């Protein structure tokens, strides 16, 4: 493909693993989720720009607008957890075990 | 010669910033029936040099900060960006001739918020952190109308290049066709740079983020703050008071352009000496309930007005 | 290459002032001195973010005016701004932009 | 060493992801994303996308990420794993970097070549407009459907987040 | 007829900002349809030659395509100069 | 005033574009010759480097089609000077 | 008196005059006494690169006129 | 929540689902999913209690990860084909990501750990949308990409779904959890036959929705969420118990009820392809589902569990719930077997 | 689509951006326009089962213009040969290649 894809694509993989291995904070997971959309933006634009897909050039913008809107939703829920417990630890979201 | 060219743009800014402090203290003095700095050197012309030396040889407190890395990172980010917002400004020739220069000065401007945010975190104090957050809410709020007001003007220019705002006003200033936008742009630039009557960070009896700083590090946050005051007014002059450009005498542009920037800057000092200070909620409700409704109304008027009059500017 | 130099020089210089700022006063060997959440602030950050995203779709308007579909381009330009106004009218009426507890 | 600027940037780009994928304190995690977002723009710029490159700075870095730092400073209450993960990440990058600069061919899932990014660029370009600019402008001339669906989602987003946060 | 006047003058004394906002926006949506010059805006955009005008092979039956740029056939921009 | 000035700017752009259109036929003609020449330079030196390779063909298309395919950057400037390679790849993107 | 404020303004005025004046004169020093070529779109860049090759010496600001035609 | 806002939020969930169904561009397919998740989290929070908050947070973290993977697949496919058409994917690695991404969206095992918990934290009406409407959009995409799906990946997810659905439900006493695990089980049937005859995936989807909608409707009528609280129904609304009994036997696939129709037709199509071992295993393990369906019938209709004194007060008021379409749904849930050849309308 | 509404109503919602040989603003062609056009017209109206086997040639060229794997392999071979002959005193680059 090209040397740049190896690193851009590996960036998505790194962030994905970071999303699937929580440490303590719910916030740190949102960054990894927002890390994944950053890699997809870059990879999308590189493919579109290189091949001169003229009309596709608006596609990365939409990916960013919707992905950003999702983040606002995720941050709103993180706030409503800190309100209930005072911290955003993931181990507090264990009520629904039973 | 390019490296020589940069230094011919960085040092003058630092000296120009230094003597804006003198001009502010003097101008504020005469509007208050007093004189201001006139003892240190002829007419106070050495006053900035005394202050500069004094601050840099004073012990910095640097208390037990939580990180002590964001403490160093905040002043670097602030002063690094402030200088960076001058490279595309045509005077009349940009140092870097960006095709989306207007879009570059918006991108860099929104990054200055971090300097505020990181200073609050580094301070290790709960009180400071609330101080930073209040200044962040004000800054981002009033940067929404800058984006739209700027966008509305470009509908009359036709592109994002800054050198094309010179061509647009070759017959007449944009202050005339767009004085409603000019009124709300000038006030937005006051609120972005924490200038009175929008200075709540320095609004003693109410709060700042750059309070724990003293000596040299403090002087950095001061240079950045005053380096943007000049830059915003240079931006305003290019946007609403376009100077005619004669290629054979490029210096003629600079003299006229410099005057219009100095007058706009001295309007910041004029305004600070006149009015009281807004409350925090009162300046939020000035944006979300007064400027934003009108900015949206005027943005619609400017998308359609060129179409209904057949006056669409060229893309190139 | 020019812009990279301009960024490097600007940030390189800013760092030199910082280090000498933290070390030049240390030339003077001074005696060792010894020794919540508010919801209404979060909504401002989120409200800005959503409007900021709605602005992102408005940025390419200067280029859109050069098309040969002014009827369609004009209709959508007003459609976005009008909805950008509706998002404001909704928060305004539902007491979103208020600072009294 | 300048003809490989894009590849060099991408190596810094990956190292940033290891920075916050290891999950340090959120304050430092957000910083790594900022450095990664800024470098990410540098990659897009060198492929000819100047509007898209600056859009990340204005919307992603100066926009979203400010709110992330804004929320962290207000809901975060200011280890061996963090160092072990960070150390592990760089080593994986180092070997991948080492094995693509040695034989200029690395096969992990896909077949990645290592001649240089410039080798695929388009030779011919003599237009009087930016193809990226004309593509983005077509949002209003062509993308009527995208505008409607996108606008209704942002409008709903405002409504949705007002319900979530009210709490009653 | 009285209610409208009794309501227009009430907001004008209380909400001058919004009265100007809705008035200005209302013109943005109405005037473009009434304007007689809106059609020229389209004509000028179509007249801007971003692309090369590839010539057409001549088969013989085309007394509408000029043989030379200065021939009298084809579209004429004499309307744009006077405008 | 803005309407009048903006309308003249649209006439001055059309004149600016027609000067380009009258010049495209010459510029396109030159580029065709230049690109073909650069390809043959690589072709001649492809034989030199690979005249003793076990089972290699000179100038072998990697496409089943016989249609002309516009060369990419790697094929033209493959073995030229770095300064000229840099100019043709990032010269325009880096121009201030 | 108010005119004692001017000396500070002039020095501030001069420091804002050097950056603009320096760029204009420095550009003319490198471009053979002309304005630095502006290349915002690929067509403009293509002609500038053509000038570099056509000029002989590898300089884009060295113009060749009719005298260079047979 | 203001009533008008609730309708517009509900109407948005349909628009998101519909955009996925009618779109022909992978971008709009992703926008449809994003619009759907955005407008469904608010209803899950309507009661505003810690469990509702946790359920949405667990739900958001799952649908978001699936969306990124789906977008990632949409881009790998773009690199190898240079197009966005919603059809067979052109890169096998992209197909795996799309398959798993849609699996996380449907809750198919082993991406299932959130379904029991999410469904258990939100009201009954919110669970109905979560288990019936939310599966149409992911199933629309599978119906269009199945030629390129990996045979062993899809069948493996189907096999694990039936097993974990059956085994999970044996240990449960919460009706919201039982329906959650029952949902996972029926998903295996929907996807197991997908490679062979997708039309039988729509037959099993339509019948599953009708039966599940009936169950949630009758639990909402009596505001019952646990096994014990449901056992008082005989003493309050005896008719409701007989309707419950009929459906649970239908859900269990017992002849001659409608719920036998899907399982019956899936076995037919898999065998024509000479798949004898897989249908036999699937049918046997379905008995695990029929077990805890029967266990509900023992405590609800076939026995009279102890009552409470206060129940005598409830006899003096009627059911003021809407119970929309309950009479029609229950009849179509049990009396459709003679109409089996009507499935050709789905072709 | 699952519900082919667009074809029924005769309205174009998102079919303009599906491919890269569709109409683009200012007639800007994509880099692989010639290959994509040929592949699409080859495999039109014969379903994907036949197109997989009958239009394989037209599609391999298309995927060659997209990722240029064969071309980058060929250039890697020439570089390795030339590099080997460089450090053996057996190669002298031409004048214009220096
Ligand atoms: C063929 C297959 C046919 C099977 C169809 C299955 C239908 C079964 C419906 C469930 C029974 C409804 C019920 O009892 O109420 C429960 C529940 C209300 O109970 P609640 O929790 O006590 O009250 C909640 C609030 O407090 C409400 O309190 P409020 O005071 O704020 O009131 C707000 C307002 C709100 O009023 C409304 O609810 C109207 C909503 C608009 C529906 C869209 C209109 C569609 C037509 C235009 C297109 O009033 C109501 O809440 C009315 C109560 C609900 C009765 C109306 C239910 C209509 C469902 C039939 C339409 C199905 C279309 C899909 C539904 C949308 C997908 C999520 O209503 C629902 O939300 C049901 C959701 C249904 C989702 C599943 C739909 C089936 C999926 C398959 C689709 C067909 C594919 C083939
Ligand atoms: C296509 C043509 C199909 C015919 C559609 C007409 C029936 C739907 C309209 C009936 C209605 O108002 O409620 C429907 C609908 C469902 O409410 P419901 O609780 O199920 O109605 C039964 C109550 O007893 C309702 O009790 P109610 O006394 O309160 O309501 C009196 C209602 C009584 O109207 C009725 O007769 C309700 C029962 C009609 C049948 C309901 C199912 C709709 C037909 C589906 C057929 C499926 C066939 C499947 C065949 C598969 C095998 C090939 O009379 C009307 O208002 C007729 C309005 C005419 C428009 O109400 C709504 O919320 C939408 C308005
Ligand atoms: C370095 C220290 C930190 C820098 C922070 C400030 C970033 C400056 C803005 C980035 C450059 C840019 O936007 O260019 C726009 C401008 C827009 O230019 P343009 O759109 O007018 O196009 C220029 C060429 N023409 C006009 C002919 C088409 O880009 C350029 O002018 C030149 C692009 C050069 C690309 C190289 C970028 C390298 C730098 C990127 C990495 C930065 C790392 C940041 C680290 C994290 C901090 C955020
Ligand atoms: C109300 C409180 C805030 C007010 C702010 C007041 C300061 C803002 C500046 C407004 C006054 C305009 C600047 C006047 C001084 C400019 C001197 C100058 O450049 O030469 C005269 C300039 C020279 O002209 P010019 O070149 O600068 O601009 C004219 C542009 N054309 C030719 C297109 C119309 O003209 C004047 O200012 C006449 C007054
Ligand atoms: C010539 C005649 C011109 C037309 C007539 C003018 C238009 C009529 C409407 C103007 C009156 C607006 C309604 C109103 O009176 O608002 C008052 C109210 C103020 O409430 P508040 O200040 O918060 O009270 C606090 C007390 N301590 O505030 C409110 O009630 C909320 C108002 C929300 C306003 C929404 C702002 C976004 C819209 C901006 C305009 C953009 C264009 C809109 C689309 C126009 C389409 C044509
Ligand atoms: C691909 C390669 C994957 C393997 C990479 C291994 C990286 C692990 C490096 C060591 C490490 O991360 O620390 C040990 C780990 C967690 O750190 P730990 O010391 O347990 O912190 C609490 C101790 N009281 O302790 C553990 O629990 C080990 C976790 C599994 C590894
Ligand atoms: C066809 C394409 C265009 C489609 C446009 C359709 C979308 C329009 C979007 C509008 C933007 C959202 C704003 C709408 C909400 C208005 C504000 C509101 O919510 O109501 C507030 C007000 C409450 O009243 P209250 O404060 O309690 O007491 C004093 C009232 N006098 O309640 C009220 O009673 C205030 C009166 C209602 C506001 C009327 C606004 C009318 C605006 C259109 C005017 C057009 C005039 C243009 C003519 C210009 C010619 C000079
Ligand atoms: C309550 C009342 C609300 C307000 C009602 C409307 C007020 C009047 C309109 C003001 C708003 C529009 C602003 C237009 C400014 C245009 C500048 C101008 O006025 O100059 C006239 C200009 C001169 O023509 P020119 O071609 O240059 O002549 C020399 C050629 N050899 O020629 C032109 O500019 C071109 C003509 C543009 C016409 C635009 C207006 C189209 C609508 C037709 C007029 C009806 C007005 C609408 C009334 C209903 C309001 C709802
Ligand atoms: C004193 C009361 C007022 C208070 C201060 C007011 C504010 C400060 C004034 C505004 C700032 C202007 C400061 C600069 C003015 C002095 C410079 C000047 O007048 O222009 C000199 C210029 C230099 O000549 P040059 O550009 O090198 O020409 C080379 C041709 N081969 O010669 C030229 O050719 C120019 C044409
Ligand atoms: C633990 C380490 C993690 C990974 C980062 C590596 C840092 C140390 C260098 C080892 C790898 C290497 O070989 O460094 C070298 C590479 C340079 O590549 P290039 O200019 O394209 O070389 C090809 C061009 N020549 C032939 C002219 C050299 O450096 C980088 O790309 C920079 C990485 C960020 C600093």
Choose among A28, A56, A60: nearest Cβ to D29: A28
Helix (H) or strand (E) holding F48: helix F2-49
The closest of C2, C97, C80 to C44, measured between CA atoms, is C97
The superfamily CATH assigns to domain C7-93 is: NADH:ubiquinone/plastoquinone oxidoreductase, chain 3 (1.20.58.1610)
Chain H contact partners (≥3 CB pairs within 8 A): A, D, I
- Which residues make Cβ contacts (< 8 Å) with residue B37, sequence separation at least 6? B22, B25, B26, B29, B44, B47
Produce one character per residue of H154-178: b if its CB has 16 or more CB atoms within 10 Å, e if not. Answer: bbebbbbbbbbbbebbeebeebbbb
What chain E residue is nearest to D131 in terms of C-alpha separation? E50
Flag whether D touches F (3+ CB pairs, 8 A cutoff): yes
Q: Which fold has domain D4-162?
A: 1.20.120
Phi-psi region of I77 (alpha: psi -120 to 50; beta: other; left: phi over 0): alpha
Choose among B67, B107, B117: nearest Cβ to D58: B107
- Which residues make Cβ contacts (< 8 Å) with residue I22, sequence separation at least 6? A55, I15, I16
Count structural domains, chain G: 1
Choose among B13, B45, B97: nearest Cβ to G11: B45
| Closest chain I C-alpha to A56 CA, distance in angstroms | 7
Rounded Cα–Cα distance for residues D97 and C15 (Å): 31
**Nearest CA owner, ligand 9 atom 23:** B251
Contacts of E38 in chain C (CB under 8 A): 70
**Nearest CA owner, ligand 5 atom 1:** E23
Choose among B94, B176, B314: nearest Cβ to F10: B314
Range list of H helices, chain I? 5-9, 33-42, 47-54, 56-67, 69-86
Is residue B305 within 8 A of residue B298, CB to CB? The reply is no
Mutation probe of ligand 4 site: the residue of B256, B271, B275 with most atoms within 8 A of C-beta: B256
Range list of H helices, G1-70? 6-15, 18-30, 42-54
CA of B175, closest atom in ligand 4: 10
CB of H75 less than 8 A from some CB of A: yes
The 10 Å Cβ neighbour count of residue D30 is 27
Is residue H220 within 8 A of residue H124, CB to CB? The reply is yes
Cβ of H328 closer than 6 Å to ligand 1, yes or no, is no
Mutation target among F2, F14, F16, F26 for the E interface, most CBs of E within 10 A: F14
The closest of B145, B137, B142, B105 to B120, measured between CA atoms, is B137
Cβ of D8 closer than 6 Å to ligand 10, yes or no, is yes
Is residue D44 within 8 A of residue D52, CB to CB? The reply is yes
Tell how far the Cα of I84 is from the centroid of ligand 10, in angstroms: 23
SS3 I15: coil
CA of E35, closest atom in ligand 8: 41
Contacts of E41 in chain C (CB under 8 A): 70
Cβ of B312 closer than 6 Å to ligand 4, yes or no, is no
Tell how far the Cα of D20 is from the centroid of ligand 6, in angstroms: 17
Query: For residues E72, E74, E79 and E80, what is the CA-based torsion angle, rounded to 10 degrees?
Result: -110
Give the residue numbers spanning the domain of G18: 1-70
Range list of H helices, chain D? 5-21, 26-46, 50-55, 65-75, 80-102, 131-141, 144-166
The helices-and-strands tally (H runs, E runs) of chain A is: 3, 0
| Closest chain D C-alpha to I69 CA, distance in angstroms | 8
Rounded Cα–Cα distance for residues A47 and A56 (Å): 10
CB of D156 less than 8 A from some CB of C: no
| Closest chain B C-alpha to C69 CA, distance in angstroms | 11
Chain A contact partners (≥3 CB pairs within 8 A): C, D, H, I
Sort strands D110-113 and D105-108 into parallel, antiparallel or unpaired. Answer: antiparallel
Flag whether H touches G (3+ CB pairs, 8 A cutoff): no
Produce one character per residue of F62-77: b if its CB has 16 or more CB atoms within 10 Å, e if not. Answer: eeeeeeebebbbbbbb
Contacts of H23 in chain I (CB under 8 A): 1, 13-14
Angle (deg, nearest 10), helices C39-56 and D144-166: 180
Are B285 and C77 inside 8 Å of each other by CB?
no
The residue written with tokens 């118990």 in the block is H241
Contacts of H48 in chain D (CB under 8 A): 166-168
Tell how far the Cα of F12 is from the centroid of ligand 8, in angstroms: 25
Cβ of D35 closer than 6 Å to ligand 3, yes or no, is yes
Rounded Cα–Cα distance for residues I86 and I79 (Å): 10
Report cis status (omega within 30 of 0) of the bond before H256. Answer: yes
Q: Which domains does chain A have, with CATH numbers?
A: 3-85 (1.10.287.3510)
The 10 Å Cβ neighbour count of residue G66 is 5
CB of F56 less than 8 A from some CB of E: no
CB of F95 less than 8 A from some CB of D: no
Domain coordinates of chain D in residue numbers? 4-162
CB of I23 less than 8 A from some CB of E: no
Count Cα atoms within 13 angstroms, Cβ side, for H284.
7
Rounded Cα–Cα distance for residues H2 and A98 (Å): 32
Tally of residues, chain E: 83
The closest of B293, A81, B245, G31 to H61, measured between CA atoms, is A81
Rounded Cα–Cα distance for residues H332 and B103 (Å): 61
Is residue A3 within 8 A of residue D5, CB to CB? The reply is no
How was this model experimentally determined? cryo-EM
Choose among C60, C61, C76: nearest Cβ to D144: C76
Is residue I58 within 8 A of residue I38, CB to CB? The reply is yes
Tell how far the Cα of A7 is from the centroid of ligand 10, in angstroms: 13
Mutation target among H17, H27, H29, H31 for the D interface, most CBs of D within 10 A: H31
Report cis status (omega within 30 of 0) of the bond before B92. Answer: yes
Are A74 and H55 inside 8 Å of each other by CB?
no
Is residue D126 within 8 A of residue G43, CB to CB? The reply is yes
| Closest chain D C-alpha to E15 CA, distance in angstroms | 25
Rounded Cα–Cα distance for residues C70 and C66 (Å): 8
The closest of E38, F12, C65, E34 to B309, measured between CA atoms, is E38
Rounded Cα–Cα distance for residues A89 and A81 (Å): 9
Rounded Cα–Cα distance for residues H201 and G51 (Å): 67
Domain coordinates of chain C in residue numbers? 7-93
Report cis status (omega within 30 of 0) of the bond before B121. Answer: no
């Amino acid at each position: 493909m090209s040397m740049v894809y190896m690193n851009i694509m590996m960036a998505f993989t790194v962030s994905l693993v970071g999303l699937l291995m929580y440490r303590s904070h719910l916030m740190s997971s949102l960054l990894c989720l927002e890390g994944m959309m950053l890699s997809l933006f870059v990879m999308a634009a590189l493919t579109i720009l290189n091949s001169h897909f003229t009309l596709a050039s608006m596609m990365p913008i939409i990916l960013l607008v919707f992905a950003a809107c999702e983040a606002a939703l995720g941050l709103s829920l993180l706030v409503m957890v800190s309100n209930t417990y005072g911290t955003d630890y993931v181990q507090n979201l264990n009520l629904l075990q039973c | 010669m390019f490296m020589i060219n940069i230094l011919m743009l960085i040092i003058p800014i630092l000296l120009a910033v230094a003597f804006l402090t003198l001009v502010e203290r003097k101008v504020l003095g005469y509007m208050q029936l007093r004189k201001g700095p006139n003892v240190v050197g002829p007419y106070g012309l050495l006053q900035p040099i005394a202050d500069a030396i004094k601050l840099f040889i004073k012990e910095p407190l640097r208390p037990a900060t939580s990180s002590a890395s964001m403490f160093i990172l905040a002043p670097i980010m602030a002063l690094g960006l402030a200088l960076t917002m001058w490279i595309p400004l045509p005077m009349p020739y940009p140092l870097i001739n960006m095709n989306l220069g207007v879009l570059f000065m918006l991108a860099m401007s929104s990054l200055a918020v971090y300097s505020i945010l990181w200073s609050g975190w580094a301070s290790n104090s709960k009180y400071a952190l609330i101080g930073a957050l209040r200044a962040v809410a004000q800054t981002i709020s009033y940067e929404v109308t800058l984006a739209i007001i700027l966008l509305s003007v470009l509908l009359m220019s036709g592109s994002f290049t800054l050198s094309t705002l010179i061509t647009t006003q070759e017959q007449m200033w944009l202050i005339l066709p767009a004085w409603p936008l000019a009124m709300m742009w000038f006030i937005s630039t006051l609120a972005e740079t924490n200038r009175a009557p929008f200075d709540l960070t320095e609004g003693e009896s109410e709060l700042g983020f750059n309070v724990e700083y003293a000596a040299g590090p403090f002087a950095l946050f001061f240079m950045a703050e005053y380096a943007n005051i000049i830059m915003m007014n240079i931006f305003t002059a290019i946007l609403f008071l376009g100077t005619s450009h004669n290629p054979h005498m490029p210096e003629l542009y600079t003299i006229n352009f410099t005057i219009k920037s100095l007058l706009l800057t001295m309007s910041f000092l004029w305004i600070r000496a006149s009015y009281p200070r807004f409350r925090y909620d009162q300046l939020m409700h000035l944006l979300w309930k007064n400027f934003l409704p009108l900015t949206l109304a005027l943005c619609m008027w400017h998308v359609s007005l060129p179409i209904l009059t057949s006056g669409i500017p060229p893309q190139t | 290459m020019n812009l990279m130099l301009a960024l490097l020089t600007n940030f390189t210089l800013a760092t030199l002032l910082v280090i000498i700022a933290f070390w030049l006063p240390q030339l003077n060997v001074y005696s060792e001195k010894t020794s919540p959440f508010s919801m209404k602030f979060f909504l401002v950050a989120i409200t800005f973010l959503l409007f900021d995203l709605e602005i992102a779709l408005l940025l390419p308007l200067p280029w859109a005016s050069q098309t040969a579909n002014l009827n369609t381009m004009l209709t959508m330009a007003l459609f976005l701004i009008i909805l950008l106004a509706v998002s404001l009218a909704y928060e305004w009426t539902q007491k979103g932009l208020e600072w009294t507890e | 060493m300048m003809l490989y600027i894009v590849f060099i940037l991408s190596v810094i780009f990956v190292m940033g992801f290891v920075g916050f994928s290891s999950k340090p304190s959120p304050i430092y995690g957000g910083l790594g994303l900022i450095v990664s977002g800024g470098v990410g723009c540098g990659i897009v710029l060198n492929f000819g996308g100047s509007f898209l490159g600056l859009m990340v700075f204005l919307i992603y870095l100066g926009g979203m990420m400010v709110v992330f730092g804004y929320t962290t400073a207000m809901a975060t209450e200011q280890n061996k794993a963090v160092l072990g993960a960070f150390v592990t990440g760089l080593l994986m990058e180092f070997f991948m970097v080492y094995y693509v600069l040695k034989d200029k061919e690395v096969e992990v899932v896909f077949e990645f070549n290592g001649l240089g990014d410039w080798v695929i660029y388009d030779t011919g370009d003599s237009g009087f407009f930016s193809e990226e600019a004309m593509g983005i402008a077509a949002l209003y001339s062509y993308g009527t459907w995208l505008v409607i669906v996108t606008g209704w989602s942002l409008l709903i987003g405002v409504v949705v987040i007002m319900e979530i946060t009210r709490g009653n | 007829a009285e209610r409208v006047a009794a309501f227009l003058k009430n907001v004008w004394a209380k909400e001058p900002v919004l009265v100007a906002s809705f008035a200005i926006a209302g013109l943005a949506v109405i005037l473009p349809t009434l304007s007689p010059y809106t059609k020229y805006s389209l004509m000028i955009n179509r007249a801007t030659p971003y692309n090369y005008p590839v010539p057409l092979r001549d088969d013989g039956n085309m007394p509408d395509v000029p043989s030379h740029p200065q021939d009298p056939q084809g579209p004429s921009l004499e309307w744009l100069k006077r405008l | 005033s803005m309407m009048k000035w903006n309308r003249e700017r649209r006439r001055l752009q059309i004149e600016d574009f027609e000067a380009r259109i009258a010049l495209m036929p010459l510029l396109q003609a030159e580029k065709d010759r230049r690109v073909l020449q650069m390809l043959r330079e690589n072709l001649e030196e492809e034989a030199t480097v690979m005249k003793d390779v076990p089972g290699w063909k000179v100038g072998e298309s990697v496409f089943h089609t016989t249609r002309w395919v516009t060369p990419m950057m790697g094929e033209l400037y493959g073995l030229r000077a770095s300064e000229e390679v840099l100019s043709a790849t990032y010269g325009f993107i880096w121009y201030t | 008196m108010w005119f004692e404020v001017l000396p500070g303004i002039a020095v501030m005025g001069v420091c804002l005059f050097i950056p603009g004046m320096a760029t204009a004169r420095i550009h003319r020093f490198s471009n053979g006494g002309k304005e630095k070529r502006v290349a915002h779109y690929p067509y403009q860049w293509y002609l500038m690169e053509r000038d570099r090759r056509v000029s002989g010496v590898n300089r884009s600001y060295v113009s060749k006129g009719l005298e260079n035609i047979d | 929540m203001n009533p008008i806002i609730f309708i517009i939020i509900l109407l948005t969930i349909m628009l998101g689902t519909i955009i996925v169904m009618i779109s022909s561009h992978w971008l709009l397919v992703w926008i449809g999913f994003e619009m759907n998740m955005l407008a469904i989290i608010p209803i899950m929070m309507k009661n505003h209690n810690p469990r509702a908050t946790e359920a949405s947070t667990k739900y958001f973290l799952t649908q978001s990860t699936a969306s990124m993977l789906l977008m990632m697949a949409v881009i790998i496919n773009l690199m190898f084909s240079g197009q966005w058409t919603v059809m067979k994917l052109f890169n096998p690695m992209a197909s795996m990501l799309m398959t798993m991404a849609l699996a996380m969206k449907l809750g198919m095992a082993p991406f299932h750990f959130w379904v029991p918990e999410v469904t258990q934290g939100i009201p009954l009406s919110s669970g109905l949308i979560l288990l019936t409407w939310q599966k149409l959009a992911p199933m629309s995409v599978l119906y269009q990409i199945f030629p390129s799906i990996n045979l062993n990946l899809i069948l493996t997810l189907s096999v694990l779904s039936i097993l974990i659905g059956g085994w999970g439900g044996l240990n449960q006493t919460q009706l919201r959890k039982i329906m959650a695990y029952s949902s996972i089980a029926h998903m295996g049937w929907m996807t197991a036959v997908l490679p062979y005859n997708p039309t039988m995936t729509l037959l099993n989807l339509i019948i599953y929705i009708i039966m599940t909608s009936t169950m949630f409707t009758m639990f909402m009528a009596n505001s019952t969420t646990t096994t014990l609280s449901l056992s008082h129904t005989w003493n309050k609304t005896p008719i409701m118990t007989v309707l419950i009994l009929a459906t649970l036997l239908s859900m269990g696939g017992l002849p001659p009820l409608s719920g036998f129709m899907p399982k019956w037709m899936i076995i037919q199509e898999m065998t024509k392809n000479n798949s004898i071992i897989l249908p036999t295993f699937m049918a046997i393990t379905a008995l695990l589902n029929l077990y805890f369906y029967m266990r509900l019938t023992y405590s609800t209709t076939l026995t009279m569990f102890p009552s409470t004194n206060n129940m005598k007060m409830k006899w003096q008021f009627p059911l003021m719930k809407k119970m929309t379409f309950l009479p029609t749904m229950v009849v179509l849930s049990t009396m459709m077997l003679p109409l089996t050849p009507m499935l050709s309308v789905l072709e | 689509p699952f519900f082919d509404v667009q074809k029924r109503l005769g309205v174009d919602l998102d079919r303009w951006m599906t491919i890269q040989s569709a109409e683009q603003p200012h007639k800007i062609p994509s880099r692989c326009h010639a290959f994509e056009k040929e592949w699409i017209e080859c495999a039109h109206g014969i379903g994907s089962i036949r197109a997989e086997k009958e239009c394989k040639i037209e599609f391999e060229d298309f995927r060659e213009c997209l990722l240029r794997q064969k071309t980058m392999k060929r250039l890697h071979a020439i570089r390795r040969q030339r590099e080997k002959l460089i450090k053996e005193g057996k190669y002298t680059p031409p004048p214009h290649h220096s």
